Amino acid sequence: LNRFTQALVIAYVIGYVCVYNKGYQDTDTVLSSVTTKVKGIALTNTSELGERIWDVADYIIPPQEDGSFFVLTNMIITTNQTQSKCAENPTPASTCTSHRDCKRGFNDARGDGVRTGRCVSYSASVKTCEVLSWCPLEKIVDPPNPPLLADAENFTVLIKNNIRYPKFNFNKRNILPNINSSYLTHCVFSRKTDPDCPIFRLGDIVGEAEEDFQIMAVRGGVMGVQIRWDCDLDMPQSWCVPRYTFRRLDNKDPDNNVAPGYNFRFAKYYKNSDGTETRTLIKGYGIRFDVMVFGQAGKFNIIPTLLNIGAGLALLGLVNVICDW
Amino acid sequence: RFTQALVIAYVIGYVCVYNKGYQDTDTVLSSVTTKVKGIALTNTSELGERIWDVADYIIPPQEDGSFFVLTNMIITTNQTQSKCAENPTPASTCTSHRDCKRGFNDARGDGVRTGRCVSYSASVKTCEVLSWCPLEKIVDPPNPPLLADAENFTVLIKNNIRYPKFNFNKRNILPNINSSYLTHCVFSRKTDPDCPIFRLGDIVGEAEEDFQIMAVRGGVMGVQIRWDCDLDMPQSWCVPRYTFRRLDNKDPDNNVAPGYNFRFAKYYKNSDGTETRTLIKGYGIRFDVMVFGQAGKFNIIPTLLNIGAGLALLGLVNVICDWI
Amino acid sequence: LNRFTQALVIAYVIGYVCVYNKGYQDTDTVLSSVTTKVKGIALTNTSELGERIWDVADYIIPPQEDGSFFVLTNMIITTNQTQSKCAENPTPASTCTSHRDCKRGFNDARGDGVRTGRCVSYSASVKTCEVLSWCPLEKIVDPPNPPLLADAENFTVLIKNNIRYPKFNFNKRNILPNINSSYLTHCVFSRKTDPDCPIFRLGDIVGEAEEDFQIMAVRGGVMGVQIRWDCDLDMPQSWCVPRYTFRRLDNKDPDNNVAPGYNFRFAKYYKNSDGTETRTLIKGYGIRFDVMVFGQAGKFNIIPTLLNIGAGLALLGLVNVICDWIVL
Numbered sequence: 010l011n012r013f014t015q016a017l018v019i020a021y022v023i024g025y026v027c028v029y030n031k032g033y034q035d036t037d038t039v040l041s042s043v044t045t046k047v048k049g050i051a052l053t054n055t056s057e058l059g060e061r062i063w064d065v066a067d068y069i070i071p072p073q074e075d076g077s078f079f080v081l082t083n084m085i086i087t088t089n090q091t092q093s094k095c096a097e098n099p100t101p102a103s104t105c106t107s108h109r110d111c112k113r114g115f116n117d118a119r120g121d122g123v124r125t126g127r128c129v130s131y132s133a134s135v136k137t138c139e140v141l142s143w144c145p146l147e148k149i150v151d152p153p154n155p156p157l158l159a160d161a162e163n164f165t166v167l168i169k170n171n172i173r174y175p176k177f178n179f180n181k182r183n184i185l186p187n188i189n190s191s192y193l194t195h196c197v198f199s200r201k202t203d204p205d206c207p208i209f210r211l212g213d214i215v216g217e218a219e220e221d222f223q224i225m226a227v228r229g230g231v232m233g234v235q236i237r238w239d240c241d242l243d244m245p246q247s248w249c250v251p252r253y254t255f256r257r258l259d260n261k262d263p264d265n266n267v268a269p270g271y272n273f274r275f276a277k278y279y280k281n282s283d284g285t286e287t288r289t290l291i292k293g294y295g296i297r298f299d300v301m302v303f304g305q306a307g308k309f310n311i312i313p314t315l316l317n318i319g320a321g322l323a324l325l326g327l328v329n330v331i332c333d334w
Numbered sequence: 335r336f337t338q339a340l341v342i343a344y345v346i347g348y349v350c351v352y353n354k355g356y357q358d359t360d361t362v363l364s365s366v367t368t369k370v371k372g373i374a375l376t377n378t379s380e381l382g383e384r385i386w387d388v389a390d391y392i393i394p395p396q397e398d399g400s401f402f403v404l405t406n407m408i409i410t411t412n413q414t415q416s417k418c419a420e421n422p423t424p425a426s427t428c429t430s431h432r433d434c435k436r437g438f439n440d441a442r443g444d445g446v447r448t449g450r451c452v453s454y455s456a457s458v459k460t461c462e463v464l465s466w467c468p469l470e471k472i473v474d475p476p477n478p479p480l481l482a483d484a485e486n487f488t489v490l491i492k493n494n495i496r497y498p499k500f501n502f503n504k505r506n507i508l509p510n511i512n513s514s515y516l517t518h519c520v521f522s523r524k525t526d527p528d529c530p531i532f533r534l535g536d537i538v539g540e541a542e543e544d545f546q547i548m549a550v551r552g553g554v555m556g557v558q559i560r561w562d563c564d565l566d567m568p569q570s571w572c573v574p575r576y577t578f579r580r581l582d583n584k585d586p587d588n589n590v591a592p593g594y595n596f597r598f599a600k601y602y603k604n605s606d607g608t609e610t611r612t613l614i615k616g617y618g619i620r621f622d623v624m625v626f627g628q629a630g631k632f633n634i635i636p637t638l639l640n641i642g643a644g645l646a647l648l649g650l651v652n653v654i655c656d657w658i
Numbered sequence: 659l660n661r662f663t664q665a666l667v668i669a670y671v672i673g674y675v676c677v678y679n680k681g682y683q684d685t686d687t688v689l690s691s692v693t694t695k696v697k698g699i700a701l702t703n704t705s706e707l708g709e710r711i712w713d714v715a716d717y718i719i720p721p722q723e724d725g726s727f728f729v730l731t732n733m734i735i736t737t738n739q740t741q742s743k744c745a746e747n748p749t750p751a752s753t754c755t756s757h758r759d760c761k762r763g764f765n766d767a768r769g770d771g772v773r774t775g776r777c778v779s780y781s782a783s784v785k786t787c788e789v790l791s792w793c794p795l796e797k798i799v800d801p802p803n804p805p806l807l808a809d810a811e812n813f814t815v816l817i818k819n820n821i822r823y824p825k826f827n828f829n830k831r832n833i834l835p836n837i838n839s840s841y842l843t844h845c846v847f848s849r850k851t852d853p854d855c856p857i858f859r860l861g862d863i864v865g866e867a868e869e870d871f872q873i874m875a876v877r878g879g880v881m882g883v884q885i886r887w888d889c890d891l892d893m894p895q896s897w898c899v900p901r902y903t904f905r906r907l908d909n910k911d912p913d914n915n916v917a918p919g920y921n922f923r924f925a926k927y928y929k930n931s932d933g934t935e936t937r938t939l940i941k942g943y944g945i946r947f948d949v950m951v952f953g954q955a956g957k958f959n960i961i962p963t964l965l966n967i968g969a970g971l972a973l974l975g976l977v978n979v980i981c982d983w984i985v986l
């Protein structure tokens with residue numbers, strides 16, 4: 010059996026660990042850099058404001074980040090805000106019977122405005138603590154449904170990705186050389202037909218991830234666009250190609266978390282003709298796209314090959330001793 | 335027979351529990367999400383009581399992972415494209431039209447120099463420059479900080495992570511957690527260790543620093559999240575380890591641009607159609623969420639490899655020590 | 659010749675793989691954090707707008723990102739935009755003979771504005787589909803040359819980089835301790851004279867990368883500022899130093915790609931005195947600087963050393979068999 014185990018370990022190292030595990034290569038992680046450009050426009054027949062356009066280029070993307078990017082899909086717009094005092098929103102913690110309940114400063118922190126000791130009426134029927142803040146306060150209301158920027162589904166993002174492996178002084182780009190420029194003029198990614206088209210539709214991105222753009226885009230979320238560069242360096246540089254994946258990253262489950270979906274506040278400031286400041290507060294919901302790039306590669310190397318082969322010999326010594334037992 | 339019992343206790347006992355060398359390694363793919371909550375009041379000198387809603391007014395701008403909380407500032411207003419005197423400086427000062435060179439003397443004092451020489455005041459005179467005017471006065475930042483209420487702010491930090499190799503992923507919000515809990519919990523090493531909502535002050539504090547001394551001139555806080563999991567263990571044992579470091583140097587010497595700050599502006603189309611802007615030198619603390627980690631389950635490839643060398647190693651151990 | 663191969667593998671492991679490959683160390687990747695601050699100002703004698711200043715601090719850098727940063731170098735400014743209906747731009751797809759060609763909503767998506775069914779004249783000689791949108795449209799024209807913010811070449815960016823190796827509880831900063839503060843007051847990086855000056859001039863950055871700031875800055879691009887921390891931790895902590903590299907990242911070749919160079923749109927919003935909104939649309943071209951920090955380090959360790967030595971012994975066993983076959 011001594012000649013049998015010896016033929017087993019030789020088929021175990023060369024056959025198993027050197028093609029299946031490919032242990033004869035040195036590893037190297039990817040040094041990445043990405044670039045996005047979103048194209049589209051969206052209409053909205055607001056209740057009172059009437060038809061309105063949002064050019065996803067300028068109006069839709071706060072702000073214009075490096076790798077990742079954020080597409081506005083839904084919103085609650087508070088206007089004509091000015092530095093002033095006013096009534097908090099009706100709430101067990103905010104409600105007051107008189108000047109005694111309102112404490113200056115402390116009752117402030119809670120309702121997004123600083124409380125002055127004064128107690129005022131939120132309306133005729135009810136009364137609550139006065140707060141100085143950006144006024145009028147933001148109404149407490151649910152986001153519109155369907156989403157205003159529902160046209161977002163049909164947007165499209167061009168994703169350029171240059172990568173390099175420092176160790177192997179090798180680099181490549183997600184736009185393969187065998188590609189027409191007129192092709193990228195109107196192509197759009199799809200696993201089936203056009204797999205090399207770096208322009209992805211937003212909906213397709215969310216879809217592919219087993220989700221639904223229209224249900225998401227109401228309260229927001231974050232989509233992970235994973236690009237994987239797993240190349241065999243010893244193979245032709247032509248075989249090196251990006252593998253695109255798509256995940257929803259945040260939790261949809263209302264329980265067992267907080268800040269469901271994804272959203273943030275931002276503002277537009279306007280010097281009124283009176284010289285006084287006013288701002289428009291915007292609670293924007295949307296989908297944030299995180300472009301996550303990673304990978305590994307390796308050519309042949311004598312250092313790792315000899316070191317694995319060496320242990321394969323010592324391992325055949327034990328194996329023949331395991332055959333004796 | 336004694337050395338053979340030593341190497342067996344050396345590999346299985348030492349390198350396979352202490353070094354845990356029977357596992358395959360994998361680095362983390364991370365993704366984070368922050369939301370800062372708070373508000374702050376300022377009784378400016380002249381401007382009087384004023385509110386800054388850390389949500390909208392306090393965070394320029396709203397970045398991905400990391401985020402930046404405005405804590406102090408020097409506000410220059412009513413800026414317009416125009417000419418005016420540079421700030422008094424050995425390089426900028428002039429005796430007459432001869433000292434002011436057009437364009438060149440520009441680069442230095444944050445405005446372009448027209449050949450003209452003008453008085454910065456009655457007693458002194460310096461090169462005229464076109465620029466955003468009036469210039470930003472040269473003054474120290476307020477102390478205490480205006481947005482000193484910042485200490486008491488709180489940041490929710492969500493962190494989803496995945497290990498590609500082991501097709502495994504977890505989130506910093508553990509499943510054994512009420513939603514009402516996260517409604518008002520606040521992190522603390524002692525009582526609530528699983529509360530992902532950290533107070534800013536606590537963050538700076540924990541790092542052995544002081545929010546009020548920092549927030550005056552600014553700095554950058556590293557919020558390190560470490561995911562070191564044993565994948566062969568139950569997926570339930572996989573948990574984030576939070577650390578806190580100040581990253582920038584507080585020492586005035588041996589560096590430049592102490593603390594952390596930047597300029598930004600607010601533009602306003604005047605009714606005359608002419609442009610004016612408000613220049614703001616914002617100081618603050620920038621929070622860098624740095625996520626990293628490693629994990630590994632059992633694997634025959636690495637185990638046999640290491641055991642193999644352990645045998646060859648007992649050959650040199652017994653042959654070389656017998657020679658000694 | 660067996661005593662010969664045994665002296666060969668010994669000189670192969672200790673001599674080759676343990677000094678040249680340094681395989682006796684454990685590896686560790688760098689934890690990084692960077693901070694940039696760009697300083698400069700730039701003038702522009704626009705056609706009609708006359709002399710104008712852009713303080714790279716505030717006016718030049720949309721927006722103020724974490725690691726990477728973006729310097730505005732060229733632009734096409736569309737002003738007095740307001741929500742309104744107006745003619746699309748002349749195009750085979752947009753052109754219309756009458757009300758019949760213009761479909762409400764659908765002909766919208768294409769020309770950056772939503773089409774109302776009505777067909778209007780883009781001018782006296784031609785007519786095209788009316789669209790509601792931010793109006794007037796952005797004229798279709800090529801970016802100015804030379805670039806308006808051509809003064810950008812002479813800007814300078816301070817790049818502060820703190821790094822740490824978690825495993826070895828070791829950390830260091832790209833500003834070495836042997837450095838005066840007055841030095842960094844006016845130093846400027848150069849491979850030759852001042853190699854330890856973390857304040858790089860933009861042009862020098864692009865130059866070093868074998869490119870030209872003035873040709874780039876017209877249509878934009880992205881520069882990779884690579885910082886490499888390759889330290890030997892068993893060596894004195896003083897030998898640990900950053901190596902700076904520079905490499906244009908985007909493709910200049912017009913063919914075999916799209917979105918050549920680098921640019922984006924952004925806007926300035928103004929509440930008109932009438933209460934109505936107006937905005938200034940800006941197609942900004944520029945160079946985006948990506949600070950890419952990476953590295954590896956390692957001290958001595960018995961685990962990896964014994965491992966490699968162990969295989970060197972088994973390797974000497976087969977090496978005896980290699981000279982056997984050579985003997986025939």
Ligand SMILES: *[C@@H]1O[C@H](CO)[C@@H](OC2O[C@H](CO)[C@@H](O)[C@H](O)[C@H]2NC(C)=O)[C@H](O)[C@H]1NC(C)=O
Binds near residue numbers: 187188202203
């Ligand atoms: C440029 O020219 C090619 C013309 O064939 C085109 O190739 C294909 O594109 C379609 C996309 O739906 C595939 O259905 C089709 O199989 C491909 N055709 C063949 C057989 O070549 C390329 O896509 C264009 N650019 C390149 C070079 O990829």
Ligand SMILES: *[C@@H]1O[C@H](CO)[C@@H](O[C@@H]2O[C@H](CO)[C@@H](O)[C@H](O)[C@H]2NC(C)=O)[C@H](O)[C@H]1NC(C)=O
Binds near residue numbers: 512
């Ligand atoms: C999850 O939910 C419950 C309900 O809020 C928490 O219960 C509180 O928990 C503690 C610890 O057992 C009690 O001492 C308190 O009396 C409870 N508070 C009140 C007033 O209801 C429970 O702690 C939470 N579990 C976790 C995630 O630790």
Ligand SMILES: *[C@@H]1O[C@H](CO)[C@@H](O)[C@H](O)[C@H]1NC(C)=O
Binds near residue numbers: 054059762
């Ligand atoms: C948008 O809103 C109005 C008011 O309901 C409607 O009359 C008009 O048709 C709508 N426009 C489009 C293009 O849908």
Ligand SMILES: *[C@@H]1O[C@H](CO)[C@@H](O)[C@H](O)[C@H]1NC(C)=O
Binds near residue numbers: 159160161162163
């Ligand atoms: C997106 O695409 C299709 C095809 O144009 C269109 O019919 C549908 O209305 C679009 N969805 C939205 C909500 O814009």
Ligand SMILES: *[C@@H]1O[C@H](CO)[C@@H](O)[C@H](O)[C@H]1NC(C)=O
Binds near residue numbers: 113377382383
């Ligand atoms: C802030 O400043 C003024 C002026 O001294 C004072 O009258 C007012 O009470 C202060 N506001 C608060 C609520 O702290």
Ligand SMILES: *[C@@H]1O[C@H](CO)[C@@H](O)[C@H](O)[C@H]1NC(C)=O
Binds near residue numbers: 412414
């Ligand atoms: C702003 O600009 C003009 C510049 O001449 C000056 O007259 C005016 O005083 C300034 N306005 C304010 C409110 O300070």
Ligand SMILES: *[C@@H]1O[C@H](CO)[C@@H](O)[C@H](O)[C@H]1NC(C)=O
Binds near residue numbers: 482483484485486
């Ligand atoms: C935040 O909290 C405590 C609450 O008692 C208070 O003492 C402190 O003044 C607050 N800090 C600041 C700086 O407002």
Ligand SMILES: *[C@@H]1O[C@H](CO)[C@@H](O)[C@H](O)[C@H]1NC(C)=O
Binds near residue numbers: 436437703708709
């Ligand atoms: C800029 O533009 C004008 C108009 O051509 C010229 O008169 C003026 O000298 C220029 N300014 C500078 C400082 O170069």
Ligand SMILES: *[C@@H]1O[C@H](CO)[C@@H](O)[C@H](O)[C@H]1NC(C)=O
Binds near residue numbers: 738739740742793
């Ligand atoms: C800007 O917008 C309006 C509305 O279309 C137009 O009537 C007006 O002429 C424009 N103003 C200027 C300054 O050209």
Ligand SMILES: *[C@@H]1O[C@H](CO)[C@@H](O)[C@H](O)[C@H]1NC(C)=O
Binds near residue numbers: 810812
């Ligand atoms: C920048 O620097 C050089 C050297 O001072 C100067 O000759 C050149 O004019 C400058 N470039 C621009 C665009 O001002």
Ligand SMILES: *[C@@H]1O[C@H](CO)[C@@H](O)[C@H](O)[C@H]1NC(C)=O
Binds near residue numbers: 836837841
């Ligand atoms: C600091 O000081 C001395 C002053 O003579 C000078 O030689 C040296 O170059 C400076 N060191 C650095 C790091 O610039």
Ligand SMILES: *[C@H]1O[C@H](CO)[C@@H](O)[C@H](O)[C@H]1NC(C)=O
Binds near residue numbers: 933
């Ligand atoms: C917004 O709010 C206040 C409410 O009293 C009103 O005085 C002001 O005119 C409004 N601003 C405009 C001009 O829309």
